[PDB]
Write a protein that binds this ligand. Structure first.
Ligand SMILES: Nc1ncnc2c1ncn2[C@@H]1O[C@H](CN(CC[C@H](N)C(=O)O)CC2CN(Cc3cccc(Cl)c3)C2)[C@@H](O)[C@H]1O
Ligand SMILES: [Zn+2]
Length: 149
């Protein structure tokens, strides 16, 4: 509808009104919508620090040794977004084999941002989920479940 940079500019204030973090029956805590989200709507940024992929093993190791949950989003084989210290509510988005959301790497004014889009209209109360990029069982509960993450 509106160009990608024109759609990114409006998020921080609107995401606070559109989504919340609560207990999820899929796993631990999840992201849920507080009001209906239109199909194609830019929901929230997966906020954090873009770091080199080779650095993730040691960073995860450091966080695990401190008893701090490690929240990372895989961009590609070379970069990852570390949402552990400088993240937002998007770090709680669970995986699903019938997602209602999808992740995209956008580039606004030279800077890379991971944004979450709604692929269908999402209704008040629904949990927001995306198909994770990647031995680990899946609890999304969908009919067409891949049964592993
Ligand atoms: N469909 C699915 N079927 C089963 N498992 C699923 C799932 N989709 C998501 N997951 C699990 O979640 C992880 C992704 N996380 C998303 C938010 C998560 N729900 C959360 O409460 O923090 C962020 C991770 C960082 N970690 C901190 C943590 C570590 C141990 C226990 C707990 Cl409570 C929390 C969690 C995946 O790696 C899976 O392990
Ligand atoms: Zn599934």
């Amino acid at each position: 509808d509106l160009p990608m940079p024109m759609r990114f500019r409006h998020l921080k204030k609107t995401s606070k009104e559109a989504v919340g973090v609560y207990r999820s029956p899929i796993h631990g805590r999840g992201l849920f919508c507080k009001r209906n989200i239109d199909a194609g709507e830019m929901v929230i940024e997966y906020a954090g620090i873009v770091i080199r992929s080779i650095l993730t093993d040691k960073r995860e190791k450091y966080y695990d040794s401190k008893g701090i949950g490690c929240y990372m989003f895989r961009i590609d084989d070379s970069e990852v977004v570390d949402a552990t210290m400088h993240g937002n509510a998007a770090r709680f988005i669970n995986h699903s084999c019938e997602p209602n959301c999808y992740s995209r790497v956008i580039n606004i004014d030279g800077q890379k941002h991971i944004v979450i889009f709604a692929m269908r209209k999402i209704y008040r109360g629904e949990e927001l989920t995306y198909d994770y990029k990647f031995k680990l069982p899946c609890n999304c509960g969908a009919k067409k479940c891949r049964k592993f993450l």
